[PDB]
């Protein structure tokens, strides 16, 4: 749908997101710094969160899932206000 | 409530002329200005508040130097706040000025919780205390809680949040100097295995093997492990590595198997499975392994059976008899239910072993025990285990 | 000109009417209407375009059934797109329809780079394939590059990006039916250890012990691990766990220790260190422990020695004696090796004080100690004063 850059930037992210879930420790700031960078509609931005949750569950990263859940909350509220505003 | 003028002028001299040596001599003056006589009582409340607002200047910059020499430690601790500790190191538990000077800290701790692990640091950093951690026990039994363990658990957790590199530095003396408080609760382990990287994991693993750190003893560990079943994947992997480093016998923690569930403890199942490979199977181990429920997607059982049945064929067959005896005869209902599980496990092994060339089920002690067991069970099962029991007929 | 007109309706025939049974029987037609009417050697490419858009229904979602049973597989081989494969297995080699169909595929894989790992899945799932894998071999021949390994690695990498559940499912069959193209080089390993979670790692570890999977041979292994020191912490960690499952002796890979640097190979060092503990030390193993240079921060060598000597005081002392004497005779490197060995021993001695065990006070060490004093100048003799002067008596 988007450009050659975007399509690919989103692939590079997915990959890096998977490396980031598989790091030791509890610094998930690198993950969000990255998740902010995804290109496209709020749909795909929220698809990137959904995906990261699936990963982090496999590694039982409970805190990280909480924080991903909050992105999901925020991506939802913004979308709810979209219809209200438009 | 407002500041005494003799004290007040010297507060912001540290602020203006922000040069090391002079500030510390300016701070030494505050120690001598706290003694005198009565000098109010609850004046420290606002006193700690100002010093807190003053010293929040270095409560952001990470504490451990780049270079870790014993002189780099002494070189780094030359901060005005740290001299406040030095005085308390050079005193006694039975002094009038003591319990008064401590109360200053105990009031400041509320306004800066990061003072907790800072104390811990100082005691091990400077040879002004060498290793007299007794000061922290005083500091703890001086906090509102009064409990040492709980007070320690607060600082280490605080430390993990703030400066994980410090946490990895402090660990040894924390586990060493407060063994009673540390070796038992799986709080401190979880904490530690929740932040460390593989670089720091090796460092711990080595400390243990050098004998400079013990993180669990045999009478405490099995409980800690049951707890880790509930941790994050890597936290578990690390836990199991540190275990493997202490050289507590696998026998100690073997009862854990009853807890391990196919679909939900893959980490510990892996870890354990590869440890059991190295062991001469005992009576217990064989009993434990067989005890697991027969789940057609669980391959833990026949995996360790195969490998044992092929390194230690006779010893296993011994153990398998031993148990079969102990179950056929001695609650019959439960006995027969348990014995069914054993039979199912055995059948799985029988089937696996047909993909290779080993005469395990061939050897006699096995038959003697099966032959015997068939004559004392329900005829419904006798026919499910046709193939299994049929291999004994020729005796 | 576009499609064939006697075929144009067949293009959109099964585009709507989609019940599995009345789809495979409404498919056998498309098979046999290429034999009677040849349809050139070029008409093969046009049918590939309108079937790629036809079966998009399928490529998304999952390729694997929930319950792992033979009928659950048979349910997913019953799926329409899986009939083509059914044909290709029943045929014969000299039959010219064997290559004809193959060239339709070798063109469809060219457009859709995912038919490959499907092909693999079928050849296990269906029992009309009869286990035989020669069909994948035939496929990789036809593909422009012509190589089986290069092809396999493309398919598996595709699978590892799409359906990791399937990649884990397949991994036993791949490493079994294609040992030559799998075992020697660990690109396939790297693929797996880069996506597998804790459950899957266990799943795989059991296969190895069941003997239902072999991912290393003794000749291939040490190389693979050398390559692993580059990978991500958890990939490396997963790799050692798979190795430890295999029962190859630690001696096979003990040379890897030369490649292991303190400041950068912690996962690898940890695993090895924790494995070396449970080992009856061979002379070579000692030799490699001792061979790692003395950094004041690297605690690994004194870890493993302290531990070995508890369990094997004398056997170890022998090994230190032999190597010591062996390097005593042999000069530039000999003295550097000797110095390094001496230094290592000194670290152990400054360590062992915390125990009242006796390693350093036994003959085979003592013998070797005074003997090797001869070939030393004051530069060394004064540094290790304590170590040497521990053996005054003879």
Curated annotation (Swiss-Prot), chain A:
Coiled coil: none
UniProt tissue specificity: Expressed mainly in bladder, lung, head and neck carcinomas. Not expressed in normal tissues except for testis.
Protein name (Swiss-Prot/TrEMBL): Sarcoma antigen 1
Location of the protein in the cell: Nucleus
Superkingdom per UniProt: Eukaryota
Swiss-Prot record, chain B:
Residues in coiled coil: none
Subcellular localization, as worded in the UniProt entry: Nucleus; Cytoplasm
Keywords: Acetylation, Cytoplasm, DNA damage, DNA repair, Nucleus, Phosphoprotein
Gene Ontology CC terms, in alphabetical order: cytoplasm; INTAC complex; integrator complex; nucleoplasm; nucleus; site of double-strand break; SOSS complex
SS bond list: none
Main location class: nucleus
Gene Ontology annotations of biological process type: DNA damage response; DNA repair; double-strand break repair via homologous recombination; mitotic G2/M transition checkpoint; regulation of transcription elongation by RNA polymerase II; response to ionizing radiation; RNA polymerase II transcription initiation surveillance; snRNA processing
Function per UniProt: Component of the integrator complex, a multiprotein complex that terminates RNA polymerase II (Pol II) transcription in the promoter-proximal region of genes. Component of the SOSS complex, a multiprotein complex that functions downstream of the MRN complex to promote DNA repair and G2/M checkpoint. The SOSS complex associates with single-stranded DNA at DNA lesions and influences diverse endpoints in the cellular DNA damage response including cell-cycle checkpoint activation, recombinational repair and maintenance of genomic stability. The SOSS complex is required for efficient homologous recombination-dependent repair of double-strand breaks (DSBs) and ATM-dependent signaling pathways.
Quaternary structure, from the entry: Component of the Integrator complex, composed of core subunits INTS1, INTS2, INTS3, INTS4, INTS5, INTS6, INTS7, INTS8, INTS9/RC74, INTS10, INTS11/CPSF3L, INTS12, INTS13, INTS14 and INTS15. The core complex associates with protein phosphatase 2A subunits PPP2CA and PPP2R1A, to form the Integrator-PP2A (INTAC) complex. Component of the SOSS complex, composed of SOSS-B (SOSS-B1/NABP2 or SOSS-B2/NABP1), SOSS-A/INTS3 and SOSS-C/INIP. SOSS complexes containing SOSS-B1/NABP2 are more abundant than complexes containing SOSS-B2/NABP1.
Similarity comment: family membership: Belongs to the Integrator subunit 3 family.
The name this protein goes by in its record: Integrator complex subunit 3
Organism expressing this protein natively: Homo sapiens
Residues of the whole record sequence present: 573 to 977 of 1043
């Amino acid at each position: 749908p988007g450009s050659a850059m975007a399509k690919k930037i989103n692939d590079d992210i997915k990959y890096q997101l998977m490396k980031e879930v598989r790091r030791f420790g509890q610094n998930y700031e690198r993950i969000f710094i990255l998740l902010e960078e995804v290109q496209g509609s709020m749909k795909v931005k929220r698809q990137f969160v959904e995906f990261t949750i699936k990963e982090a569950a496999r590694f039982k990263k409970v805190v990280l899932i909480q924080q991903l859940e909050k992105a999901l909350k925020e991506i939802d509220s913004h979308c709810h206000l979209r219809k209200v505003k438009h | 409530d407002q500041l005494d003028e003799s004290l007040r002028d010297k507060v912001l001299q540290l602020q203006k002329g922000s040069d090391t040596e002079a500030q510390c001599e300016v701070m030494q003056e505050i120690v001598d200005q706290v003694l005198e006589e009565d000098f109010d009582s609850e004046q420290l409340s606002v006193l700690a508040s100002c010093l807190q607002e003053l010293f929040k200047a270095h409560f952001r910059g990470e504490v451990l130097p780049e270079e870790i020499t014993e002189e780099s430690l002494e070189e780094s601790v030359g901060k005005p706040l740290y001299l406040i500790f030095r005085n308390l190191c050079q005193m006694q538990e039975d002094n009038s000025s003591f319990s008064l000077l401590l109360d200053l800290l105990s009031e400041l701790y509320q306004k800066q919780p990061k003072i907790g692990y800072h104390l811990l640091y100082y005691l091990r950093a400077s040879k002004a205390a060498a290793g007299k951690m007794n000061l922290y026990e005083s500091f703890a039994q001086a906090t509102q809680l009064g409990d040492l363990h709980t007070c320690l658990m607060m600082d280490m957790k605080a430390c993990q949040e703030d400066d994980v590199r410090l946490l990895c530095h402090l660990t040894p003396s924390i586990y060493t100097e407060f063994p009673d408080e540390t070796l038992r609760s799986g709080e401190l382990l979880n904490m530690i295995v929740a932040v460390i990287d593989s670089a720091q994991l090796q460092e711990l693993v080595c400390h243990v093997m050098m004998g400079n750190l013990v993180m669990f003893r045999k009478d405490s560990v099995l409980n800690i492990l049951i707890q880790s079943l509930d941790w994050e994947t890597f936290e578990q992997y690390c836990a199991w590595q540190l275990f493997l480093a202490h050289n507590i016998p696998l026998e100690t923690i073997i009862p854990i198997l009853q807890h391990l569930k196919y679909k939900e403890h893959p980490e510990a199942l892996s870890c354990l499975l590869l440890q059991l490979r190295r062991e001469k199977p005992s009576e217990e181990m064989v009993k434990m392994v067989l005890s697991r429920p027969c789940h057609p997607d669980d391959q833990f059982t026949t995996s360790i059976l195969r490998h044992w049945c092929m390194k230690h064929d006779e010893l296993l067959a011994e153990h398998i008899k031993s148990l079969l005896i102990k179950n056929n005869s001695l609650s019959s209902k439960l006995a027969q239910l348990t014995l069914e599980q054993i039979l199912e496990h055995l059948d799985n092994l029988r089937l696996n072993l047909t993909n290779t060339k080993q005469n395990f089920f061939s050897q006699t002690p096995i038959l003697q025990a099966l032959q015997h067991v068939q004559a004392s069970c329900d005829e419904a099962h006798k026919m499910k285990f046709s193939d299994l029991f049929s291999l004994a007929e020729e005796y």
